[PDB]
């Protein structure tokens, strides 16, 4: 009963856009910046980020209620106020956020959709970029990390062709002096493998 667990926990989980869009600051109860992760899996990333950064409000977003319920288990345990989980029903994120309502966007290990005919499904494809540009402020940024070389190669070109500026590029994240990295479950699971992790900060 994924849907059941989510519904019993409205202090953390948002289920319908009507009670979200333009209302996120009211929902958190302060004007702290709102940073969103799209495709938040089982919540290790948003949880670890909320802990590192008490004065930032995080929203973990997933299309699947099942996996969001696992994120909830993690979020309930931590018990900190600067997180919320959002179930999205398939619509554009503009149904859930007003233009400029969020401050930064995170994409972690997003589905690569390697087949050419599935380009449109990649979260770094231009129609998703249109949506992200709207919901972020002017000069708003996407911070994107993945171990998928093909996806990262594609996304650098997609970002650039769209007209975004690349502010930083990491081609071996774990080997760099980058600090504050919070690993996803996937990232943990495979840390022992030691394959390079790619990262970029891109700006609209």
UniProtKB/Swiss-Prot annotation:
Keywords: Methyltransferase, S-adenosyl-L-methionine, Transferase, tRNA processing. Substrate binds at residues 115, 147, 184-187. GO terms for cellular component: tRNA methyltransferase complex. S-adenosyl-L-methionine binds at residues 37, 62, 89, 111. The active site is at residue 111. InterPro entries: SAM-dependent_MTases_sf, tRNA_(Gua-N-7)_MeTrfase_Trmb, tRNA_methyltr_TrmB_bact. One of its GO terms (molecular function) is tRNA (guanine(46)-N7)-methyltransferase activity. Its EC number is 2.1.1.33. Residues 117-122 are annotated as: Interaction with RNA. Pathway: tRNA modification; N(7)-methylguanine-tRNA biosynthesis. PANTHER family: 3-DEOXY-D-MANNO-OCTULOSONIC-ACID TRANSFERASE/TRNA GUANINE-N 7 - -METHYLTRANSFERASE, PENTACOTRIPEPTIDE-REPEAT REGION OF PRORP DOMAIN-CONTAINING PROTEIN. Catalyzes the formation of N(7)-methylguanine at position 46 (m7G46) in tRNA. HAMAP family: tRNA_methyltr_TrmB. This is tRNA (guanine-N(7)-)-methyltransferase. It comes from Streptococcus pneumoniae serotype 4 (strain ATCC BAA-334 / TIGR4).
